[PDB]
Point group: C3
Chain length 445, copies 3
């Protein structure tokens, strides 16, 4: 079994079944903190070049802290916006009153610890960088003098190494208005992310999914700059929670269906509008119109429910009978008979109209299929490329069976004289109720 595909010659559409859902439904916010060192501008009387490198290094530390302070203005938000709303809610708790002392006390003994906030949110806190312990115990005795004298270059490089992460975090936040996605390694390293997942209150099997797909979790996470307060810098990393797992998913590919009679071009067209990803979800179906929202790993589909529409489960009847009386299947009518192709999971839909050259070829055996006027389909078995006019498409070399469901093209059932041929967002019954309107004008006059 695994990934299969069904093409409907009747409706010029294909369905890629066999996928398993993982759907984002929740968020887990985590507060990542960096201890900072509050220091006044010292005046080391000596002009030692070893110290001058430390002084200008310290200025980059000061400018980064100041840059982070200029982003706190940023945080107030509009309007939906709901993607980071759970993380922004945590930043507001960090302001009052003040809640930072509880994070300092918990991270005073360790680096990763759980903290309960004043609004009930129990957050995993992390201490990824301790700049305060460094600059005070190893840089303070160098500048806290008249003259400078004792200073080594290993401390200059050690400072640049411990500093660098901060500069990187500030740089990413600066050119992203305080919110970045995906979450970079500098925002949260893999060892920190893998440890963070293992400590989250989630299922034992949900941990293995996020651990086996850490690169996907980053692409669906947010890093939100919160406060800079009392020798502490804090930002929230908002991790996704997948409440819908292992339910079936299928991808719908649609292409224009037009009549191909010998006339100059006076033909009627028809195109299904319900293309996108579909996944069973809580007795209904979550529909994702923008395919760029879902990321497919192998046979698994990672989507965000916030970018989805929920349809009745009867929406799948359009893939069995477009004229079913249970669900009014969505179509659109026009006369734009321009050739195009869609590359499916295990094949390619080709809508060839006019004088366009539509072929499917093998890279060593030449052309193996030529498409006639109308909507057709070819499997990826033996095919390497698809050519429509002057643009070349590459067929997916994924293994799987393709089922060609032969059927009469639906557009042939309509009389072109009575056909409403410019419906932008209609449906099957919506076209039928308009055909009856035109027939009433003609017969009863």
């Amino acid at each position: 079994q695994n990934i299969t595909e069904e093409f409907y010659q009747s409706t010029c559409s294909a369905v890629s079944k066999g996928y398993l859902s993982a759907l984002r439904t929740g968020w887990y916010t985590s507060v990542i903190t960096i201890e900072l060192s509050n220091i006044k501008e010292n005046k080391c009387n000596g002009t030692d070049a070893k110290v001058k490198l430390i002084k200008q290094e310290l200025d980059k530390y000061k400018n980064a802290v100041t840059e982070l302070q200029l982003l706190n203005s940023a945080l107030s938000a509009t309007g939906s916006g709901s993607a980071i709303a759970s993380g922004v809610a945590v930043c507001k708790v960090l302001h009052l009153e003040g809640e930072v002392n509880k994070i300092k006390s918990a991270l005073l003994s360790t680096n990763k610890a759980v903290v309960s906030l004043s609004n009930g949110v129990s957050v995993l806190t992390f201490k990824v960088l301790d700049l305060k312990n460094y600059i005070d115990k190893q840089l303070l005795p160098i500048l806290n003098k008249q003259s400078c004298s004792i200073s080594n270059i290993e401390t200059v490089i050690e400072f640049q190494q411990k500093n660098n992460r901060l500069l990187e975090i500030t740089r990413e936040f600066s050119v992203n208005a305080g919110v970045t996605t995906p979450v970079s390694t500098y925002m949260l390293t893999n060892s920190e992310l893998l440890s963070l997942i293992n400590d989250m209150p989630i299922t034992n099997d949900q941990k293995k999914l996020m651990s086996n797909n850490v690169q996907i979790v980053r692409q669906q996470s947010y890093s939100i700059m919160c406060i800079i307060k009392e020798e502490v810098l804090a930002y929230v990393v908002q991790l996704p929670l997948y409440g819908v797992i292992d339910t079936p998913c299928w991808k719908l590919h649609t292409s224009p269906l037009c009549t191909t009679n010998t006339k100059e071009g006076s033909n009627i067209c028809l195109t299904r509008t319900d293309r996108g990803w579909y996944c069973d979800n809580a007795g209904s179906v979550s529909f994702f119109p923008q395919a760029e929202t879902c990321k497919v790993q192998s046979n698994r589909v990672f989507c965000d429910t916030m970018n989805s529409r929920t349809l009745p489960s009867e929406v799948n009847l359009c893939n069995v009978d477009i004229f079913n009386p249970k669900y009014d299947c969505k179509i659109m009518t026009s006369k734009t008979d321009v050739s195009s192709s869609v590359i499916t999971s295990l094949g390619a839909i080709v809508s060839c109209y006019g004088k366009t050259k539509c072929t499917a070829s093998n890279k060593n055996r030449g052309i193996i299929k030529t498409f006639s006027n109308g909507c057709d389909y070819v499997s990826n078995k033996g095919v390497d490329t698809v050519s429509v006019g002057n643009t070349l498409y590459y067929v997916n070399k994924q293994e799987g069976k393709s089922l060609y469901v032969k059927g009469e093209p639906i557009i042939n059932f309509y009389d072109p004289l009575v056909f409403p041929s410019d419906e932008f967002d209609a449906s099957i019954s919506q076209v039928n109720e308009k055909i009856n309107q035109s027939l009433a004008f003609i017969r009863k006059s």
Copy 2:
């Protein structure tokens, strides 16, 4: 007062009033220069590892300069494009003939100075990096020899520190075709940007707005690579000017309005198309259809006028009476009764149709409101989340009064048999003039 909100049950739309405009209307171009050092490839006879680090460091300097020279090809542009047209105009003045000597003479004594160009543009010039003074007075005597001998690692690190900014500037320009936005700290640091704002010929109050919102000025600025010429590298930072300030702004949220009779789904819908940001501007109204163009800070709305349409001030009458005879209010008709929600500034519009579960809940008190078939609205008072089907929305926790304007849903005034139910971009009178067309066909036959 401050931020308030009005919901119109009649038209399924809400207005978020109480905002204050800042609108970009102009540009201030500034030329940021880096003195470079023109050096031929020296052959230091010794293989000293301290010098080999300087030699490969110097190669990164040469490759960055060469990379900047490959971007000057880039600059010619199409086509609108008008965002950087004022900055590109300055780059063309820098080419002739040559104007760079005037920038060298002005920046020979200081770092920030005003320069008048050959085409009347008086530009604030900046000298942010002096690589020529460094490599000639501290790196030239090291390689300008047979053997190498005297060379310290502090000079190797000092070179990497003075170099780094340049490498960063070239890297950002390289992967952005010579134009970057927002303007990063490496393109122009905060102290440089804050100083640059204080020297601009603008109002005393306009300086405080840009100084208090430096992160917003960056997001609406452009860094444009100009020339590399005579031991000088120059690029233009194009800063925004806000000519419209403190005028009222309001955001319009619209949602589908459909009849909800018990039939299988044979209902007529209606949706206002004029959603977006609106701001009073010079006796008219600037309309921003793409909400992503405006950035809201607190009660202040930062927009770019180049991405806006100018409508008569009577367009606000659609928020008082959709049937007013002064302005033909824009709507669209369809039959897509699919449930959805819109999160407003101080609430949420919910369009619930069919069997979809539409609720609004508090995180500790449970469900506090359930939405019936039709278009309704709930305030953010006491509400934490909104659920429509399988997708969960977070309501904005901003403080403000919400006004529920009760009224008969406008869709109930239309006879479904005579209703043109697939108008993609129509209006109130446009639907009425089409209803009269259908009534003339039926009665006078």
Copy 3:
């Protein structure tokens, strides 16, 4: 000659002729390899600060390698997707079985060498970094001991310099799901890219085009992370091939055309929908609807054929006679008489309707042209800016002749009572066949 422009008052459209095509039609994949050093975690007994800097430096090397290993999960793909399909095909060959040994043997003696793969693809292989030779011959004898003793800071900096490129490559790949575009200098330096172009099996003249436009080749290239296998890291840089060169290209600008009678606003509009870039290509015309797909250098247009539609060459007849019986010209009808402007290559189209102030001005001479109600056009000769309402447009200061083709506005030929004024995607004959439908209802009743 060179760049010229023709404005059609009849159809409210302008054509920017005189451009020369370069069209992507193929891909050249190149495997860029970095030799890595497989090392177990040593325990240098001494706590030497010079070695502690090497140890933490070595950890960044280990984390980057681990980060690259977490991206190999990523590679499986959907669905079209065809942009990197030729590069993904090479990554799959690198997996079996194993093909990496052939790359090691070829790059054992040199750095750039040609390799023939097991699936016939002859790929240019590159060895841009030799970390294995460094860490084994200069870092292994430092940590491969009890105690540590001999260790210099020049080796610490040398390691950071040789390391840095790798960290950069991993960072870009990490936040881009293993595929980056444009190809940065760290993925492939200019000297490497210029050398790579010179060794490709392409025409002598095609090499000069890619060498003279290396910044454009990067913007149309892809860097694809392949495998990490046997002390080797490999990623594919997918370079564009331009099979269509020096064929004519022209850009079509369209704007709404509406009647301007004195009524309240009861006017009919008409707008050509076929705007975009057009280039002659293999006896047909490649049409690029999204202008952001093509990049114009001087008079040369760089486009990707995968983002194009192929139309019959008769599509240009709409720029000579919109009513020609050979090609049914695509238009759309509405009543949205809102003022707007389009900046062409050598002028500006202005659609002024209602009470909107539409002007074209010179920066020193003031207003030089005021636009009346209707669709007009002004050349860039003497014009600096165009004002429509509250938004200001900058006209392109490119040199070239503009031809004003006077003609009766096409919208004046239609009777508003019989005009179908809400066609979303129609054509000339499509509107005529609908006008005849309404005339049959009225006369034969």
